[PDB]
Design a protein around this ligand. Structure first.
Ligand SMILES: [Zn+2]
Lengths: 144, 115, 131, 979
């Protein structure tokens, strides 16, 4: 219905993608916080969470609460097919089910579409790490 | 707005031309001597805003696409067919491009509109 | 915002809405119906030479929202055109508060094509005025 | 008629029928069969007949004849040759190929003398294993296990110089298809590219560009082959034979009612109004080139030649084909214009539909074309040298089969074309299957995983490091089309209306649907819906259209594309009616008794139930994930389900199918495990005893995983696995249990954890070097080679070789820096030259030390921390000391909760007895059900157990999570690297 006055400095597409991403991210963060607060005293994950909270909070939240939205190049899953992420969806589908949001956690198991979207996200992460290590090594050598 | 005018005997394009003795716009082919009276009096128009009717580009044939999201709530007003097919503009160079156009899913009747 | 508008670069692209070259059998005739009364008001007692005007006319309708946002006015555009090209680019600006604001440009006479010349002038004008 | 709640067994037996009908390397075998039967036969269909000169000599080739593999000894006696025999020596498992030649001689006497040489040996060509022309084709299990061949060996590889080389399908851009791209730094705002060929007849690369200059006025330019300088598109169109601008615009813009396309193509006409005559356009085009003509008429002739044949060869190279070429060029310009306006999205290079995969077939066809051209050139040189006298000529002495043999051997052994035809990975059966099913990207952004790879390519399986993303692996159900002749589809199309492109007014194209066949615009059609319905019916019935033919209807673009060429990748999947599957209960019942009923997967395909969909057709189809709850009645999402997947878990590859519950892990872990499984230690082939492959590892006691996937049933993993199920407890015992290391039971290692034998093979050859014991050499026999069964220590000589010195220099071979072991087998044979060569297979016993690296199916590679005896190891109330204790803290780092679920399911399976099922997307086996099953057997539901400290006997306060888990020993060991 697009009444929905867009925010200044961005077009409709960017503004609404930002809104959807913000909603998904804050929902994921709230679910993760609730899952972490669920562990009262006996959960063995809480022992690592409260002490080693450097980078283990997100992994625990994914394990218990929700894996979360999968992003590619800082954006949701692109329409690889003709205006469609996977052939199992409908054309021009911008809902949470598509575009790479994993509703289920790791315990509940990922649906095949969610599995493929997470595979895409992990591949992007592997590429980013592979380039980042080499670039950091080059920067270190140049600086020293 | 300007369309296109073609020379007849040479089957080539007609270019704008001016005759001082009559002081009026004409269209003449540069490789021949044919001249035609110009009625539009506007050689071209530039639309940098790019305001184009997407409904004209849409063809009714796309109504029979299984991948498209068929809908039931919005009926076609031309023939009363309840079922329709809605899809976005998906056209480049349009910053404001998410409007949903509906094509009637009638048996090859066809109707394109927007709600 | 007033400080911002005088710091952000603004060509003729960002302010214009549509551009078209018409052919006028007479400036008084004014094939564009909506501009007829204003044309009659302007060309009476002309500051320029009526006999020196080119038959072609370049009419550009600007974007009202863009003009209001950048606090731009017609006289500023006209003086920018005059500074950029000189006296032999007679330009007339309709009005500010008038609905569907527009402005017209002609060429003062002083080889290849008369209309393609105006085409190239607009092409080298639309992104070079630096309003 | 319907299969409700029975869908799992039905789909799994359907997959079973598909796998035991086709196999795992079916794509390679089919491609090689197509190359041998068709490509080799068609190698002589367009090359000019050999002519030489005034006597005249003509040579022509009639037909091919390929026989079974045969080896000729030094004396030249032919003898049947077997793959095991070829593998034991360093020779090539190749079969001879003969050709029929006809030679005619004319001596200006008005008479021509023609003689035919039949079965003229043209040369030996390698025969890929398990192909239709291999001796192992159509052999039973006993027949394989009476000639020293493994029945489970997939084949699909060549034996070149005794080495098993596998051809990896090269990824390339699809041919005869128009792509519109937009480069940033380039001066062109939009570029239209079209790589074109004539199905490998000649000139493997021939592409033209249709670009448009950026306004930073839209000037459209065309770049043609053998044309150095840019040429306007209108000039090319007028050169084609359309001087009038209206005809050119008709070929460009089909609908005159669209004004913006005309007003944006106006600059193209305004830049070439000077040239209005066709001859002037030909002169303009010919004026620019590699070799400009000396005169105007020569320039016109050169321009005519380059336009007729060099550019757009796929649309036609005949004498009268200018109208079709102009129509295709206009279609390219139309595509560029509509892409500029935003009518259609820019073509995606990462899109997998626009890519083809060259299997062994096309690669060998290209190699054979090159070698045939080289042989023809050599024959011409020899004939010219021997024809100056003109006495006579002999074909037998003028043919050089050695050229073809050496070319094939060099191209399949060294792999130089690089990155193709490497030695087959024979370390694990899963590793061999993954190597036989893999894909190499053309780039030396393919880094990321595209959406179109779903079902086509395994998502999880990919290497790590610099090669990540470049190397991919096929899914279980993936297949590659071997290419079919486009003609029958053609005559069927002219059988229907298909208003031909030759005889249609341009106005009719506006409202008609364009019909393409293999990228060539064959025509237009008025009713595309019923045409596609008839095409689909024919494809399902397989009467005229084979199942591999891809048919696409772009409704919005109003186009129909038919692809019949080799390279495109497709997978078979179900066909759906209005809301019902074509697969009924009768098909399931027939497939259940697959034996003694001759009802295979081919019958299912021919019954119009399952069909092959490629990447191109995937956009036009809307799939159903599972039939159990998508065609039912609920909140309406999409009621037009036209196709359904047989099973989602089939998207994984060979290595990815090993992971149990892969959906419960994250993708980096699945990729890491796919990498690990390639180097997982275990039995790799059944006939490892007879064969001698260097760096071989065999496990003492391979076991089936307690937690398995149904896909692994078709991988023959349970037939011969790589790994052992061990009782793993997740505890931090003594600090030797760091983030990667694990601590295993020393007594249980003494009982047989991962005890392995490492076979190493040393090959030596003597030539004019003799195998004789020099006068330590104590273990050496009188033949210069130690007899098998002797323990060889460090700095010991196993091979006694002496070379003459023109008192005698010693060229013996040592044990490569103390590679202790016991010699298993000794072999001596004569090479192709007849010289005696020897092969020594030595076995070394590898017992897992505290440096060997072991990995679960979930978790990173981890070395052994320390080995504790059973009394040192903690024990439960039943005395079950864990086999391996692993770090609890490694959950965020290396292993996931998939490992915990595997442990739980393994405990449940061990207590119950039935092997647990770990199908990725099951929805009927979750954590709660496994916990309830475990609790039903007198155990804690969550898998925890009360453990007692081994050293003190004190009851450990925290109950340890202990259960049976499948672990894999890895090739990386301290014993391998100390030497
Ligand atoms: Zn004309």
């Amino acid at each position: 219905n697009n009444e929905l006055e867009p925010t200044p400095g961005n077009t409709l597409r960017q503004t609404f993608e930002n809104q959807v991403n913000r909603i998904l991210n804050d929902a994921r963060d709230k679910t993760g916080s609730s899952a972490q607060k669920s562990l009262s005293e006996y959960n063995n994950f809480k022992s690592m969470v409260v002490s080693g909270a450097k980078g283990s909070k997100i992994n625990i939240s994914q394990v218990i609460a929700v894996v979360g939205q999968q992003n590619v190049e800082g954006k949701r899953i692109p329409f690889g097919f003709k205006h469609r992420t996977l052939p199992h969806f409908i054309k021009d589908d911008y809902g949470p089910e598509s575009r790479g949001f994993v509703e289920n956690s790791y315990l509940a198991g990922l649906t095949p579409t969610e599995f493929f979207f997470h595979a895409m996200g992990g591949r992007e992460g592997l590429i980013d790490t592979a380039v980042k290590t080499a670039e950091t090594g080059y920067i270190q050598r140049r600086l020293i | 707005f300007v369309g296109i005018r073609f020379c007849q005997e040479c089957n080539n394009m007609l270019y704008p031309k001016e005759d001082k003795e009559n002081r009026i716009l004409l269209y003449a082919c540069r490789n021949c001597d044919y001249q035609q009276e110009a009625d539009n009096s506007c050689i071209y128009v530039n639309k940098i805003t790019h305001e184009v009717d997407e409904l004209t580009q849409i063809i009714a044939d796309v109504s029979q696409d299984p991948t498209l999201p068929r809908t039931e709530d919005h009926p076609c007003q031309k023939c009363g067919h309840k079922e329709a097919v809605f899809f976005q503009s998906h056209s480049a160079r349009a910053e404001d491009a998410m409007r949903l156009y509906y094509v009637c899913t009638a048996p090859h009747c066809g109707h394109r509109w927007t709600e | 915002k007033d400080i911002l508008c005088r710091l952000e670069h603004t060509t003729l692209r960002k302010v214009t809405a549509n551009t078209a070259i018409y052919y006028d059998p007479n400036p008084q005739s004014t094939v564009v119906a909506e501009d007829q009364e204003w044309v009659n008001v302007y060309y009476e007692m002309p500051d320029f030479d009526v006999a020196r005007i080119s038959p072609w006319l370049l009419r550009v309708e600007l974007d009202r929202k863009h003009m209001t946002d950048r606090k731009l006015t017609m006289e500023q555009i006209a003086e920018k055109i005059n500074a950029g090209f000189g006296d032999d680019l007679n330009c007339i600006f309709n009005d500010d508060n008038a609905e569907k604001l527009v402005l017209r440009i002609r060429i003062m006479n002083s080889k290849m094509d008369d209309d393609v010349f105006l085409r190239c002038i607009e092409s080298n004008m639309l992104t070079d005025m630096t309003l | 008629e319907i299969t409700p709640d029975l869908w799992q067994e039905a789909c799994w037996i359907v997959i079973s029928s598909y796998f035991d009908e086709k196999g795992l390397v079916r794509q390679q075998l089919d491609s090689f069969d197509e190359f041998i039967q068709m490509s080799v036969q068609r190698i002589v269909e367009d090359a000019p007949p050999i002519d030489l000169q005034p006597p005249r000599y003509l040579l022509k080739f009639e037909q091919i004849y390929l026989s079974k593999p045969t080896h000729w000894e030094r004396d030249g006696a032919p003898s049947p040759m077997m793959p095991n025999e070829a593998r034991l020596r360093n020779l090539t498992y190749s079969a001879p190929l003969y050709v029929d030649i006809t030679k005619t001689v004319i001596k200006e006497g008005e008479e021509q003398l023609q003689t035919q040489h039949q079965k003229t040996f043209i040369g030996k060509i390698p025969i890929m294993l398990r192909s239709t022309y291999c001796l192992l084709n159509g052999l039973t299990d006993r027949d394989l296990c009476e000639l020293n061949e493994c029945p489970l060996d997939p084949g699909g590889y060549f034996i070149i110089n005794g080495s098993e080389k596998v051809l990896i399908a090269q990824e390339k851009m699809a041919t005869n298809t128009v792509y519109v791209f937009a480069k940033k730094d380039s001066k062109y705002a939009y570029t239209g590219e079209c790589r074109s060929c004539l199905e490998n007849s000649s000139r493997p690369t021939s592409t033209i560009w249709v670009s448009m200059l950026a306004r930073g006025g839209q000037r459209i330019v065309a770049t043609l082959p053998y044309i150095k300088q840019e040429v306007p598109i209108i000039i090319v169109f007028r050169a084609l034979g359309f001087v009038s601008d209206r005809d050119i615009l008709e070929h460009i813009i089909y609908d005159f009612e669209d004004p913006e396309m005309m007003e944006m193509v106006k600059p193209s006409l305004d830049e070439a109004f000077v040239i209005q005559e066709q001859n002037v356009a030909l002169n303009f085009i010919g004026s620019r080139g590699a070799k400009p003509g000396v005169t105007k008429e020569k320039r016109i002739k050169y321009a005519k030649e380059v336009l007729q044949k060099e550019m757009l060869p796929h649309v036609g190279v005949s004498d009268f084909c200018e109208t079709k070429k102009a129509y295709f060029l206009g279609y390219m310009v139309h595509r560029l214009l509509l892409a500029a306006l935003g009518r259609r999205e820019l073509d995606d290079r990462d899109h997998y539909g626009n890519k083809r995969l060259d299997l062994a077939g096309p690669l060998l066809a290209f190699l054979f074309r090159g070698m045939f051209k080289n042989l023809l050139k050599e024959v011409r040189i020899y004939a010219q040298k021997f024809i100056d006298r003109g006495k006579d000529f002999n074909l037998e002495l003028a043919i050089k089969t050695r050229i073809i043999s050496d070319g094939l051997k060099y191209s399949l052994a060294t792999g130089n074309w690089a990155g193709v035809s490497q030695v087959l990975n024979r370390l694990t059966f899963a590793s061999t299957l993954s190597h036989l099913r893999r894909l190499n990207s053309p780039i030396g952004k393919p880094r990321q995983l595209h959406n179109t790879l779903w079902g086509m390519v395994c998502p999880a399986e990919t290497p790590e490091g610099h090669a990540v993303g470049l190397v991919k692996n096929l899914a279980l159900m993936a297949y590659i089309s071997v290419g079919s002749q486009p003609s029958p589809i053609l005559e069927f199309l002219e059988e229907w209306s298909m208003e031909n492109l030759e005889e249609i007014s341009p106005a009719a194209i506006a409202d008609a649907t364009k019909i393409f066949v293999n990228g060539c615009w064959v025509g237009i059609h008025k009713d595309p819906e019923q045409l596609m319905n008839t095409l689909r019916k024919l494809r399902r019935q397989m009467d005229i259209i084979v199942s591999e033919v891809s048919m696409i209807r772009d409704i919005r673009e109003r186009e129909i594309r038919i692809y019949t060429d080799a390279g495109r990748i497709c997978r078979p999947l179900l066909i759906v009616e209005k809301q019902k599957l074509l697969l009924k209960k009768r098909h399931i019942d027939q497939l259940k008794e697959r034996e003694y009923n001759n009802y295979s997967w081919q019958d299912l395909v021919a019954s119009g139930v399952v069909e092959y969909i490629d990447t191109l057709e995937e956009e036009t189809v809307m799939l159903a994930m599972t039939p159990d709850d998508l065609q039912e009645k609920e909140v309406a999402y999409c009621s037009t389900y036209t196709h359904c997947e047989i099973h989602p878990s089939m998207i994984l590859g060979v290595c990815a199918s090993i992971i149990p519950f892969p959906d419960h892990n994250q993708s980096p872990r699945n990729t890491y495990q796919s990498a690990m499984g390639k180097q997982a230690m275990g039995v790799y082939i059944t006939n490892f005893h007879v064969r001698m492959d260097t760096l071989a590892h065999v496990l003492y006691y391979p076991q089936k995983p307690l937690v398995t996937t149904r896909s692994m049933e078709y991988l023959r993993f349970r037939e011969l696995p790589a790994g052992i199920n061990s009782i793993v407890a997740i505890a931090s015992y003594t600090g030797y249990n760091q983030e990667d290391s694990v601590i295993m039971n020393r007594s249980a290692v003494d009982r047989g954890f991962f005890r392995s034998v490492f076979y190493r093979s040393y090959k030596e050859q003597e030539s004019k070097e003799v195998f004789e014991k020099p006068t330590i050499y104590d273990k050496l026999d009188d033949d210069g080679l130690i007899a098998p069964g002797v323990r060889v220590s460090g700095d010991d000589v196993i091979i006694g070789k002496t070379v003459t010195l023109p008192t005698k220099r010693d060229c013996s071979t040592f044990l490569r820096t103390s590679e202790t072991g016991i010699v298993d087998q000794v072999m001596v044979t004569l090479n192709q030259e007849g010289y005696k060569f020897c092969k020594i297979r030595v076995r070394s016993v590898r017992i897992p030390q505290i440096g060997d690296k072991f990995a679960s199916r979930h978790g990173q590679k981890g070395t052994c921390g320390i080995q504790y005896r059973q009394e040192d190891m903690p024990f439960t109330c039943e005395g079950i000391t864990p086999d391996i204790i692993i770090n609890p803290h490694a959950i965020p780092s290396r292993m996931t909760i998939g490992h915990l679920i595997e442990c739980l399911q393994g405990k449940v399976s061990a207590n119950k007895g039935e092997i647990g099922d770990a199908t990725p997307f099951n929805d009927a086996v979750n954590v709660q059900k496994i916990s309830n099953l475990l609790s039903d057997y007198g155990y804690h539901l969550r898998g925890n157990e009360v453990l007692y400290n081994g050293f003190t006997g004190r009851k450990i306060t925290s109950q340890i999570f202990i259960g049976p888990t499948y672990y894999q020993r890895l090739k990386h060991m301290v014993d391998d690297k100390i030497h």
